């Protein structure tokens, strides 16, 4: 309808698609919502896995949003130094009801200056990069600070989206969607956190992520210097 | 030698049934993931999200794993002889024949649940028995090389279960940690067993028209298997 809640996801090259598609299917289940997938131009955008998604609107044509949501992925390092994307995020965040992210999407909110003095979370492996962007880093899976809501790594998007649904509507509506989703998780292993995974598994992951972390540290301190000037 | 994993991608799919498992399985070493429909190109999910089929039925390589997601669109597939024939063709040699949520009703319409333990979405569970299944109220059910997941988000638990079978526990644990899959749902309403009675009533009231239309399709599909 013309009175729909306007929800926008930034869709960028090398996005982690589940950061976007998990929340999308939760929020698209709510009454009279319009969901936008936003990039520089409408058209195909390839996720890090090779899954092809389709942007529905340009930055220029995007209507004022009730909710803006920034997903994470390999592609976040480019976005943290993209003046056009950061300008769009700051413009929309001026008047949004909720300014939101999942996973390393919060590093993009950080680069835009929107985490200064604010409680935030991100993916467990990249949590150290919050403090240089002015955030109060919180080791919780969904973190609220006023109208800012951030989710932790990838699958936290589902927990994040049900939390947001309760704020947009009410607990009864969020619970109905949870039941329609049959979201009563029963993971076959207990390795979802660095605190519970076998030590060997946490070590192999920190070994894998080390190169990305050192590259994102340098981008993060360049982004922090631009907020300082 | 790469493990070939194929998802059926059909109009009015419930996209999270596909995209959850896709991001888990595409994280594994030595895999190639296909999104299969009658022709490559755009397929629109029930939410209006546009996905892209990568291959036709004809160009699809022999699959190690076939996975059928669910959604509003399964009713049409349950009476689509081309889709059911394609599924039977791949099921013949596939190492694993699989589904998430109401995707198991399509496996049922294809004749692949006869005498097998299976699950589906809680609201449509009564439709498994007429398609020949032994209905099991568990979130991931394995019967030989058949693995079925329950409603929508069960696809993530299903895919980690499958990952351990294709590779090993350590490989599945590495992916679970990369996905930070340590769920903390803000409510306890994911099952009809735990949700408030008012919430169950409203979910059953929303599903009723879909369930009646699917009761009718199911009994036509069962009658074809019998004849």
Sign (positive or negative) of CA dihedral A62, A67, A68, A70: negative
DSSP B13: -
Beta strands B140-143 and B65-68: pairing type? Answer: unpaired
Q: How far is CA B140 from the centre of its chain?
A: 11
Q: How far apart are CA B156 and CA B28, in angstroms?
A: 14
Q: How far apart are CA A19 and CA A15, in angstroms?
A: 8
Q: Which two tokens stand for residue A66?
A: 């009730």
Region of B101 on the Ramachandran plot (φ > 0 left; ψ -120 to 50 alpha; else beta): left
Q: How far apart are CA A141 and CA A138, in angstroms?
A: 9
CB distance A42 to A55 below 8 Å: yes
Residue corresponding to tokens 């919050």: A130
User: Which member of A172, A184, A187 has the closest CB to residue B191?
Assistant: A184
Annotated active-site residue in A38, A45, A103, A142: A103
Could you tell me where the DSSP H helices lie in chain B? Answer: 15-25, 74-77, 81-93, 103-109, 154-166, 169-178, 197-226
The answer to whether B160 contacts A189, with C-beta atoms less than 8 Å apart, is yes
The answer to whether B182 contacts A18, with C-beta atoms less than 8 Å apart, is no
The answer to whether B122 contacts A182, with C-beta atoms less than 8 Å apart, is yes
Q: How far apart are CA B226 and CA A199, in angstroms?
A: 54
B131 CA to chain A: closest CA distance, Å?
A: 22
The answer to whether A179 contacts B169, with C-beta atoms less than 8 Å apart, is no
CB distance B159 to B25 below 8 Å: yes
CB distance A157 to A102 below 8 Å: yes
Q: Which of B5, B187, B202 to mutate to test the interface with A (most CBs of A within 10 A)?
A: B187
A178 CA to chain B: closest CA distance, Å?
A: 5
Could you tell me where the DSSP H helices lie in B4-94? Answer: 15-25, 74-77, 81-93
Q: Where are the domains of chain B?
A: 1-227
Chain B environment of A181 (Cβ under 8 Å): 16, 151-153, 190
CB distance B120 to B101 below 8 Å: yes
Which CA distances in Å does B89 have to B53, B62, B75, B98? Answer: 19, 9, 20, 14
The answer to whether B153 contacts A183, with C-beta atoms less than 8 Å apart, is yes
Instruction: With CA atoms as reference, report the closest residue to A100 among A120, A86, A81.
Output: A120
Beta strands A5-10 and A33-39: pairing type? Answer: parallel
For B94-168, where are the E strands, in sequence order? 96-100, 117-118, 134-135, 140-143, 146-149
Q: How far apart are CA B201 and CA B174, in angstroms?
A: 40
Which CA distances in Å does A155 have to A128, B29, B185? Answer: 20, 20, 11
CB distance A7 to A27 below 8 Å: yes
DSSP B55: B
User: Which member of B161, B170, B183 has the closest CB to residue A185?
Assistant: B183
Q: Give the orientation angle of helix B154-166 with respect to helix B15-25, to 10 degrees.
A: 30
The answer to whether B180 contacts A124, with C-beta atoms less than 8 Å apart, is yes
Chain B environment of A153 (Cβ under 8 Å): 178-180
Q: How many angstroms is the resolution?
A: 1.3
The answer to whether A184 contacts B200, with C-beta atoms less than 8 Å apart, is no
For the question of residue A103 being annotated catalytic, the response is yes
Q: How far is CA B161 from the centre of its chain?
A: 14
Instruction: With CA atoms as reference, report the closest residue to B166 among B67, B33, B30.
Output: B30
Chain A residue at shortest CA distance from B165: A188
Q: Which two tokens stand for residue A130?
A: 């919050």
B36: β partners: B8, B55
CB distance A45 to A54 below 8 Å: yes
User: Which member of B16, B176, B178 has the closest CB to residue A25?
Assistant: B16
Annotated active-site residue in B101, B131, B147, B150: B101
In 3-state terms, chain B is what percent helix, strand and coil (to 5)?
45, 20, 40
For A47-97, where are the E strands, in sequence order? 52-55, 57-58, 67-70
Chain A to chain B Cβ contacts (< 8 Å): 210
Q: How far apart are CA A52 and CA B41, in angstroms?
A: 10
CB distance B192 to B200 below 8 Å: yes
A107: β partners: none
Q: How far apart are CA A25 and CA A19, in angstroms?
A: 11
Beta strands B50-53 and B41-44: pairing type? Answer: antiparallel
Neighbouring C-alpha atoms within 13 Å toward the C-beta of A224: 15
The answer to whether A197 contacts B16, with C-beta atoms less than 8 Å apart, is no
Chain B environment of A171 (Cβ under 8 Å): 187
CB distance B82 to B99 below 8 Å: no
Q: How far apart are CA B106 and CA B183, in angstroms?
A: 29
Residue corresponding to tokens 């299969």: B36
A 10 A CB-CB count for A186 gives 13
Q: How far apart are CA A98 and CA A72, in angstroms?
A: 17
A 10 A CB-CB count for A119 gives 17
The answer to whether B206 contacts A44, with C-beta atoms less than 8 Å apart, is no
User: Which member of B16, B35, B48 has the closest CB to residue A21?
Assistant: B16
First to last CA, chain B: 40
Q: How far apart are CA A201 and CA A197, in angstroms?
A: 6
Q: Which of B181, B202, B206, B208 to mutate to test the interface with A (most CBs of A within 10 A)?
A: B181
CA dihedral B190, B191, B195, B198 (to 10 degrees): 110
First to last CA, chain A: 44
């Amino acid at each position: 309808s013309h009175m729909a809640v306007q929800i926008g996801f930034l869709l960028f090259p090398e996005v982690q698609q589940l950061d976007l598609t998990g929340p999308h299917d939760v929020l698209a289940s709510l009454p009279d919502v319009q969901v936008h997938l936003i990039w520089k131009e409408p058209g195909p955008v390839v996720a890090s896995s090779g899954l092809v998604l389709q942007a529905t609107t340009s930055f220029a044509d995007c209507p004022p949003l009730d909710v803006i949501c920034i997903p994470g992925g390999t592609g976040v390092g480019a976005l943290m130094e993209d003046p056009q994307a950061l300008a769009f995020i700051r413009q929309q965040a001026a008047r949004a009801r909720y300014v939101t992210s999942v996973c390393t999407g919060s590093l993009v909110l950080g680069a835009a200056g929107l985490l200064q003095g604010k409680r935030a979370t991100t993916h467990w492996a990249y949590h150290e990069l919050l403090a240089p962007l002015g955030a109060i880093p919180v080791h919780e899976r969904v973190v609220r600070d006023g109208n800012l809501l951030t989710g932790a790594g990838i699958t936290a998007g589902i927990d994040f989206a049900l939390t947001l649904a309760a704020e947009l509507f009410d607990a009864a509506t969020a619970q109905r969607v949870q039941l329609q989703l049959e979201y009563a998780p029963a993971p076959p292993f207990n390795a979802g956190s660095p605190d519970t995974a076998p030590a060997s598994v946490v070590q192999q992951a920190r070994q894998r992520a080390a190169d990305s972390l050192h590259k994102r540290r340098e981008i993060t301190l360049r982004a922090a210097a631009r907020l300082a000037a």
